[PDB]
From Swiss-Prot, chain B:
The gene is lacZ. Belongs to the glycosyl hydrolase 2 family. This is Beta-galactosidase. The chain holds residues 412 to 615 of 1024 of the full protein. Changing H130 to E/F/N: Poorly reactive with galactosyl substrates. Less stable to heat than wild-type. Na(+) binds at F191, N194. Induction: By allolactose. Homotetramer. Changing E51H: Slowly inactivates galactosidase activity by reducing the binding of magnesium. It increases binding specificity.
Amino acid sequence: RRDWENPGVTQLNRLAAHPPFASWRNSEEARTDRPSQQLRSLNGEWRFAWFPAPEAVPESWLECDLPEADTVVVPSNWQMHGYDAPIYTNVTYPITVNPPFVPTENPTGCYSLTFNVDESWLQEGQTRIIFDGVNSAFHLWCNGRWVGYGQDSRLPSEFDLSAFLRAGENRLAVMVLRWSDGSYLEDQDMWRM
Amino acid sequence: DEANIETHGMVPMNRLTDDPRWLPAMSERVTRMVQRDRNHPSVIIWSLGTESGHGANHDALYRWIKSVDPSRPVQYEGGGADTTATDIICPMYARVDEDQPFPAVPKWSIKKWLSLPGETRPLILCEYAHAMGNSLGGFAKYWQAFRQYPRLQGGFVWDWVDQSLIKYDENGNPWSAYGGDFGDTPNDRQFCMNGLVFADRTPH
Amino acid sequence: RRDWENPGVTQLNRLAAHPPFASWRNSEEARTDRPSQQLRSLNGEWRFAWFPAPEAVPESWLECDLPEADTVVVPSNWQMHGYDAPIYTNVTYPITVNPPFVPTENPTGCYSLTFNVDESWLQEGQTRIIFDGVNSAFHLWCNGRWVGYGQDSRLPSEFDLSAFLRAGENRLAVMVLRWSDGSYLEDQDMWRMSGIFRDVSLLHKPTTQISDFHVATRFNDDFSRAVLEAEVQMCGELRDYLRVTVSLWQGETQVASGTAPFGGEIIDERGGYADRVTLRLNVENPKLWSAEIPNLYRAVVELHTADGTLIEAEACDVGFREVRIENGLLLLNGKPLLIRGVNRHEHHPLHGQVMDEQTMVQDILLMKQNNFNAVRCSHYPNHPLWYTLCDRYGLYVVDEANIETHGMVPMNRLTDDPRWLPAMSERVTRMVQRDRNHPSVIIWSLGTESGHGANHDALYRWIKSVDPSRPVQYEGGGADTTATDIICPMYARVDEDQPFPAVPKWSIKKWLSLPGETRPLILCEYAHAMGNSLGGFAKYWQAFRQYPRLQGGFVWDWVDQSLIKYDENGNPWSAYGGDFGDTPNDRQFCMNGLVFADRTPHPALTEAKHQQQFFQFRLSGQTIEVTSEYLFRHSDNELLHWMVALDGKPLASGEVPLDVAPQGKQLIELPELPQPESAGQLWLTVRVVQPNATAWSEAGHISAWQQWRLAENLSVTLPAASHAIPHLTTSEMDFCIELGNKRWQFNRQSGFLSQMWIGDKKQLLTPLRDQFTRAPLDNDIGVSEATRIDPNAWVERWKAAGHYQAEAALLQCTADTLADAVLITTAHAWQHQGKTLFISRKTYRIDGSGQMAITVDVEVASDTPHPARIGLNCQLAQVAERVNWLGLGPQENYPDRLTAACFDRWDLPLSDMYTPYVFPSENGLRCGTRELNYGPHQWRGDFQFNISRYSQQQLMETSHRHLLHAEEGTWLNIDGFHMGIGGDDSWSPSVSAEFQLSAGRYHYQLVWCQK
Ligand SMILES: O=C1O[C@H](CO)[C@H](O)[C@H](O)[C@H]1O
Ligand SMILES: O=C1O[C@H](CO)[C@H](O)[C@H](O)[C@H]1O
Ligand SMILES: [Mg+2]
Ligand SMILES: [Mg+2]
Ligand SMILES: [Mg+2]
Ligand SMILES: [Mg+2]
Ligand code: NA
Ligand code: NA
Ligand code: NA
Ligand code: NA
Ligand code: NA
Ligand code: NA
């Protein structure tokens, strides 16, 4: 399935959209808008590898960090890290106009992260992952198992990781595609990253 | 608040937005936006996106919003700035006194646009006074009209900050780069710099 | 991927929807609409194998026929071949409600077809396959390779097989799933079946082709001039030499034509559509289309080169008509319509939901023959041929999207969820893209019973934007939401409000004038014709005619959804909910039609025909005023026949040609009617007859009728004096009376006439007793179940009050000898647990002439539920071939459903005095009867009666008509009064107050004698 070349598939297993949540367990913290122990940020150093196309991504990556990958800061546009060139085009699409298809040479960004989750999250409640922005489409894996897929580079994509998380170390695998059928709806006059 | 939808490069511009096949993809960019930001008081108007012509998908989504959230007007400039999918006449670069009668999507003088037969909507340019390089000549002409005409309620200058990027030379000294400076081609060169301030926020 | 449990995946590799194509390579064949060599049918014998789930299907099936498979005909529903059971459920979903998931045990139908494909089809062009209907989802394979997937059981799914085919033998494998996420949007109240129930075919199109085309017709103020606008789209390589020619034909005469190269007008800053072209043809004095005169033109769309070389041609029938709502009225060609509509499901007693041309033609003819001019596709796009037939025969059509989520809680849980907007949009948009060129379709419907959600508002606007030529309606959420141009309630009553919270059903007359309301009102459903129903139908039509903005409605519904099953002896019988083991099920609720599944009319059909007549009549003196309700046609195929009779005895008759303009009037002066030579009531009956046969009716067809009482001469002459005097004999247990060869016996213990003798042959099998109950009609029952009682239903109120258990208690029984007669006086009280329900006081006067005059006076406790009837009954020993009566007929008629019946002398075989409702109940009643004759018996008076070989007891104890058995003798029920049957709906008391027996005291008299 080349879900990234089908406008009929804009996501897979993605949760419903909603207003900003923090899941406070103290009304006074909610009122004052202070931090919430139930909302953790995964921003920081991640592992990253660049590929010319998704077909070039090694399957071992799903359950094992790629030795040749680099440690980079997230969030970020990989063009700003020098992996490939940012493209500045106004009206004309950066790829051949042939919907819903995109170029076979599709820059793929493979992000990964090893993290731990406090025990209590594993015994009760629902734990979801929130990607406020991924350009322009991606597939998600947690501990080697496929979780979901999502499009639209400017809105959050959320997925329930409750059934995927384990005690100790967990690993996220995010394969980001530069181009997708979603690109046909994102032809803004700005740098294409 | 504007939906992440722009199909400017299509020919015609509404080839996708008038196609029911793309209604699903388009609807999610609109509906998920409203679901996320509808509680923000700062958001006072919803936008269906930009430069995607005027397609039947815009009308459907326009009505969806009007139904889901009647507290905010909905605007969209595609297809002539005054279609059935916008509550506000929101032209891009329409001039103060001079008409630009392009076929199908003319940009009437804003003073004239307001009184076209049957027209009663407020007019707020979603884009005007292209601030590219040494620009903003004639800016005062817009504000004199905004103040004299009740229904001419302003607009949004294009735009805030230059989209120039930092590159370094041999001596590791930084310089502002634009289209094509990364080997990117085809590219549109300096057309990515239309701000009132430099990328570092230094005022023009 | 479990695509069948993902509302985000409604298809894979499916081609865009479009109007009917045939890819003619000859313009003349396109014009005449003859067959096309480029459109083959793959209908016929296929290979089929049934599996309990998709995971049980062997991979070998993808490239090799399964030996265990059977050869079956396609199209078809596999439940009809017996592979599994069809399920009948109304509102509750046939599967657990857990969107978007379905049962793991999901019946899977594996179809396959080995067929040939000629090399010419593969050497060039595009070969695609078209599945007109697959219920409810399927994956497709061609020569072992996966092609695509499709959902929405009521619209065609097309795929390009150009790259999968080979010259010679090919094999298609189709895995059909019974359940899918699509099922959540298909909760219509009908049998739940599955399979490839619609046509399958192969269509060859050129590389450069016509990919779509829209036809529009706009007019000037008086419709004296029209402009036909045709937008045509193409696929393939764009070239300057390409051209499109749209020609309009009226028979073999080309009336107009237009040619132009591709390239539309500039649309936006990026230009226009280079792959599109709009042709505009001027048409002077166009012949207008309507259900009255279905005038049609032929539009031929030719894709060709600059100098005339044809690439391909498509075409359609064009009906010049304008549909618009103005000032609160729905107008057709500038005239306010009056919809005589009916809801019609696609149902066949043997084939299930497979539709064939014969059946469709038979339905249309019956509909038009019974004065219907409109039909609603309840509740999904129909078989494509349906629209073509409606275009040609002339019926107004409401095309409806296949969307119904009745079983959800609340009803709009999915339709208000943006996550289901994609699935919903495809059912609406693909429908419009398919049927937008059919003139018969005058209104689009967004579906039914799915509440009102934001998705409806979005799609409503989409249609309004894409096709401004037709109004859009939708009843969900209150029938008057922002998603409907027409107030279209279901079962809203005429004068009575039903103020339900949130979604009240206002009296239709009240609904129109609610503050701020200005829209027209047309019920999308009314007069629920379930079983013995349609009582009160005349009230709706009187309102429709008096109020301009009340423009009709669609009766629910056309045909009973019963299915044929065979007994141990191989004889067929009609089955309903649960008869296939299906459970849960909603029993007989699937049978609400005006006609039986085999299309035999129910008695109600005639009441509808009469009320939907297109000619109205008024009588003044000897002048009959005929008014035409036709909006466009003159009465050029009608003659008025009149007849005057004295109590059934023809006095005079004649004929007069009708020449009335649409909405015009005609005065007909009847000649001098000579006074009768005897006493009695003179009756005038008029009938509109169509001399000539038509495309929908045969010569001599009766389209309308009406009756009037003329002069009446009350009899004042007393009977010839008798010399004989009946002799009264008394015993401890009986009061016997004898006169000549006749004898009467009254049981002194029961107080009823226990026997009568002609000569010395017994006349009764059961004593003549009072009866205050009736075998419950479906309307009496409502949704009351034995395990789920609804206390409000009439049957429940009667049961709770003990009307069915009441025992007659003798209060009096005397006998007096008069000058020339014997007088028996009786009095009974029916009590239930100390409560006196009824009191019956009678007198039987037997004179020397042998006549027994029975006088009855009944008292009804004001606080007991109003009784179903007030009469007498007995089982006669006689079993005669015919029934002759002077009263309303010839068909079954009840107090609130007798406008269609006429007063006259009727004679029918006993069998016709019984209406075979699949679910047995009180039936066959005839009202306003002054004389009844059966065998040597004659009853005179002013009563209601029904007569058959079935007792009320058997009828109420029997669930299916094929289980009834003729009892000994003939059961006779003679009522002085009978309650209405109702029908405004069949799930709440619907009998209007004026037809309820609430007078408290009743009186009636009957004379029983021998002829
Ligand atoms: O119409 C427009 O004009 C600007 C030109 O700089 C810029 O491209 C905006 O994104 C676009 O909406
Ligand atoms: O409201 C309705 O009433 C009918 C009852 O027989 C039938 O279920 C229709 O499909 C439904 O729309
Ligand atoms: Mg996609
Ligand atoms: Mg642009
Ligand atoms: Mg699905
Ligand atoms: Mg229903
Ligand atoms: Na102003
Ligand atoms: Na720019
Ligand atoms: Na009316
Ligand atoms: Na029903
Ligand atoms: Na005539
Ligand atoms: Na019964």
